[PDB]
């Protein structure tokens, strides 16, 4: 997954969930998943 | 002028927070790569007794006497000790935060 | 990179102990009543 400092939803189906003290994006599109830092 | 102390059930010692996986006991040899980090839980399996010893040593004085004060401490993993003939007693605890 | 280190005497001004507390700074010595008039410490007898 692509990583950045500024993570936000890209499309409507992108959901933002915290896992292990990390803001993470989860979507059906494998491109739109992210991770902060 | 102080006294002796015996410790038992060292492996059942409590620990707050996530120090069981975060507190790093470590040591060094002298080489530029002789650093050996070790967690609480990893040390808890290898030698439970260094946990108690390493903590009390930092609280005792440092010098001739402090090295002599350390031998007055006895620590044991199990719930028994061979120092029965000395007729010890239970140690008081003024603090009220020690029992979870 | 463009932030200095504050290494010299400024390290003292920034890091010296401070209270910053009205409840701690407002305090003062404790007040007790004055004792009675005590006698002298020594007195000579005819000798």
């Amino acid at each position: 997954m692509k990583i950045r400092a500024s993570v936000r939803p890209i499309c409507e189906k992108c959901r933002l969930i915290r896992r292990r003290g990390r803001i993470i994006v989860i979507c059906s599109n494998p491109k739109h998943k992210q991770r902060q830092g | 002028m102080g006294a002796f102390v015996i410790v038992v059930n060292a492996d059942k010692v409590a620990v707050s927070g996530k120090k069981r996986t975060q507190k790093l006991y470590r040591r060094h040899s002298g080489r530029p790569g002789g650093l050996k980090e070790e967690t609480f839980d990893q040390l808890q399996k290898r030698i439970p007794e260094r946990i108690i010893e390493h903590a009390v040593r930092g609280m005792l004085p440092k010098g001739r006497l402090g090295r002599y004060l350390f031998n007055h401490l006895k620590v044991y993993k199990g719930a028994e000790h061979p120092h029965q003939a000395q007729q010890p007693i239970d140690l008081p605890l003024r603090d009220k935060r020690i029992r979870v | 990179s463009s932030r200095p280190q504050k290494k010299g005497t400024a390290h003292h001004m920034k890091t010296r102990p401070k209270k910053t507390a009205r409840w701690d700074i407002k305090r003062g010595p404790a007040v007790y009543p004055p004792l009675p008039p005590l006698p002298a410490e020594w007195t000579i007898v005819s000798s």
Partner: protein, 221 residues
């Protein structure tokens, strides 16, 4: 350490060749055996905290032994012997003192074996032979030919690092050669033939035990 099985001790006698039936050559090393190969002591966890068994070797005249050593061997009714070594195990349920250890019962044919003995003592050697350092130029005005060179960086750290590869004594210590194939047995002459080299010159003591492998024989950790 924990051994995979039980071994014995023998003496290097020399080295020779061994022609196979097809014609292939095999550089083989010969190991003899003295009289004594009897067990002397059996250790357990109840007494010593670990399981092992002693083994003696190289019978000698009784006068040469110190009187403490006599009582140690006379307990089990055992002949006088010079050397003593242990063999740590997992279970020692089938061993007693005054028990001989025939190698043919333990090493039949083609079995891998770990040899261990004392190496040849080279003495106070330099860095080129001990640590395989490179040599300086022999011409072009160079003054340093077989010297070490620099032994540190400079003001930082400001001291020589510990364990710096430097001269000193070389050889004369204990080593172990692993996974050597046994070629042939000869019970008539009481001798064993093993492929490959062996540390030391003829007459040197050694111990040979079954080859220990990490995940197969010994208990993993």
């Amino acid at each position: 350490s924990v051994d995979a099985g039980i071994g014995v001790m023998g003496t290097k006698l020399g080295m020779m060749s061994f022609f196979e039936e097809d014609g292939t050559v095999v550089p083989v090393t010969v190991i003899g055996f003295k009289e004594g190969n009897i067990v002397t002591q059996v250790k357990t966890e109840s007494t010593d905290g670990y399981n092992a068994v002693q083994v003696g070797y190289e019978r000698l005249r009784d006068r040469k032994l110190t009187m403490p050593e006599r009582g140690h061997l006379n307990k089990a009714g055992v002949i006088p012997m010079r050397h003593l070594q242990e063999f740590r195990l997992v279970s020692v349920d089938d061993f007693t003192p005054s028990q001989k250890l025939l190698f043919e019962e333990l090493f039949k044919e083609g079995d891998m074996v770990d040899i261990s003995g004392t190496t040849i003592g080279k003495g106070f050697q330099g860095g080129i032979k001990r640590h395989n350092f490179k040599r300086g130029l022999m011409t072009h005005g160079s003054k340093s030919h077989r010297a070490l060179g620099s032994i540190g960086a400079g003001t930082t750290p400001g001291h020589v690092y510990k364990g710096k590869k430097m001269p000193g004594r070389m050889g004369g210590t204990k080593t172990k050669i692993r996974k050597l194939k046994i070629m042939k047995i000869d019970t008539d002459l009481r001798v064993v033939m093993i492929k490959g080299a062996v540390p030391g010159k003829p007459g040197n003591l050694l111990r040979l035990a079954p080859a220990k492998i990490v995940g197969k024989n010994i208990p993993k950790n």
